[PDB]
Amino acid sequence: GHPYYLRSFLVVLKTVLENEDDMLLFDEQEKGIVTKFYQLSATGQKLYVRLFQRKLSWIKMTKLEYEEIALDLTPVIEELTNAGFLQTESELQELSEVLELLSAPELKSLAKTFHLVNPNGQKQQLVDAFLKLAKPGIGAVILKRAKALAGQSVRICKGPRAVFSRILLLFSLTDQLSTVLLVNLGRMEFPSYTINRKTHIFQDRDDLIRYAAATHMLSDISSAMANGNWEEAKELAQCAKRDWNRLKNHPSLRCHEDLPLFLRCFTVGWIYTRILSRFVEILQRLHMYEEAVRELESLLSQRIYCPDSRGRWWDRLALNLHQHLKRLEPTIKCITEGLADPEVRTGHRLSLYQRAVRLRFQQLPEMAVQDVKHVTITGRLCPQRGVLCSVEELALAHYRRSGFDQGIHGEGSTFSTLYGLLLWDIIFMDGIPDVFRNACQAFPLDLCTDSFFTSRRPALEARLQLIHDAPEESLRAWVAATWHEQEGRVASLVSWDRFTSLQQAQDLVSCLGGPVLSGVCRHLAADFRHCRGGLPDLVVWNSQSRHFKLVEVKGPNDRLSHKQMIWLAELQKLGAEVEVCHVVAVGGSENLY
Ligand SMILES: [Pt+2]
């Protein structure tokens, strides 16, 4: 079996069905769907999951026959049709769905039958031309010809699809979103921890329904922007917003504010707030700097959702009010109350202060960052199209010459791996409610919140101190104990391939020493998602002197962000040698293209 589809899908079902709290989020007819799936032949299931994992559409039978899923497809198709899982071309009625089935040559023919301008144009141009032209009923003739070219086609029924899609959603809350069917899930070993729920995330079936819907909406818009369709991301935002202004006053949402942050992010209101945030990003690309502000004030006006997205909101409110423009009178109105917001991280506090400095009151405060050592290195920029490496790979070579034979470009991951190795027991400890809810988590659900540290404070305080005052020998021992206990395998916070060997991990740890590791581990436990991002590109070290350097690499016209300046300062404060390594694009005279 060179797909993993059914295998992973079956593991997903097992994981979700285990929790009887979750299964009450489906009615009997819906759980009936799940029973029916199990009753299907192995082959019917292999086909269903394959269709289920890909983006939804009709599939030609010829395409299913060609990719050789069974010897005779007819009985499989019938089993699936009888069970309510699949529908056939008799139900295929929407012109746009039919056109989508067609190949480039097929569309080209249709175009000649119907005398379109450019029968040799792009598939999507031709499709749009057909749709536009489709208004004895001409659109009907087009539909009939097009259906005829398409041939027998199938499509998974939207009803059972939604059951499985919600099951898939329950399986991994937010931690291209169903790629889980693509990896070998069944082969993965998860950490040993105890499931322990106390608090429901979803009130009832409806709550999960609404959350699933909001989730799909956000994902459509997120992808639209990434492809560059800025016009076509604006209208669903407004569709969302219309719905949001009704939803925010819904009774089902009153319980969501009694959830700790680490569960609250798995609720509708959180999803809409993320929509509204994406919405603001849209207007900024569309030069509509007026309406963005109106939405930023509304986001900032509330403290229920996305508190970690406050600094970015104030920072954009200011930048918009500044160079977008009127009036320069209420920008500092926003900068001052921004600087008063305790949810705003140091990086955004700087960008706000850095703008208040631009001047003609202005009472407080005092923002200043320690400078770190800068270095310039030389390299040969390759043509955008026309031996042989990337910017960091280059820098590594410079440090190799400079004396640091060992080096790793892992960014934050190298440290979050050490962290996972040194704090495994605490990260996975029992007695914290709501934090492990199923058997397939790689971390506790509160890793990235203030709640992680507070719920484990005594163990962390003892452990962080144990590390700080530890001799090198102990550190090597701890890394080994975890490594061996988790067989270099269990799926977690630890990137088992980040290091060449347990031996290399042990060397790094003997160079960093207790104090530095403890400081970084303390940071990772206090604010994981933000510490990790701010950790520099490389760690390099000399194997004999045990000296090491943390190094950020900046290519030509690459700039140290505010966030990075702060974290380099924090690392330096812990006693680590820290350096910015600039690369200057230089000429060569000995190898062209
Ligand atoms: Pt994309």
Author numbering: 371 to 505, 517 to 556, 570 to 754, 766 to 791, 810 to 1016
Text from the published report:
In 2010, four groups identified a novel FA-associated nuclease, FAN1, that directly binds to monoubiquitinated FANCD2, participating in ICL repair. FAN1 is a structure-specific nuclease and possesses preferential endonuclease activity toward 5′ flap structures and a weaker 5′-3′ exonuclease activity in vitro and has been hypothesized to cleave DNA in multiple steps. The FAN1 nuclease is recruited to the damage foci through its UBZ domain and acts as an effector by executing one or more DNA strand incisions during ICL repair. Previous studies have indicated that the depletion of FAN1 or mutations that defect the nuclease activity cause hypersensitivity to ICL-inducing agents and defects in HR, suggesting its significance for efficient ICL repair.
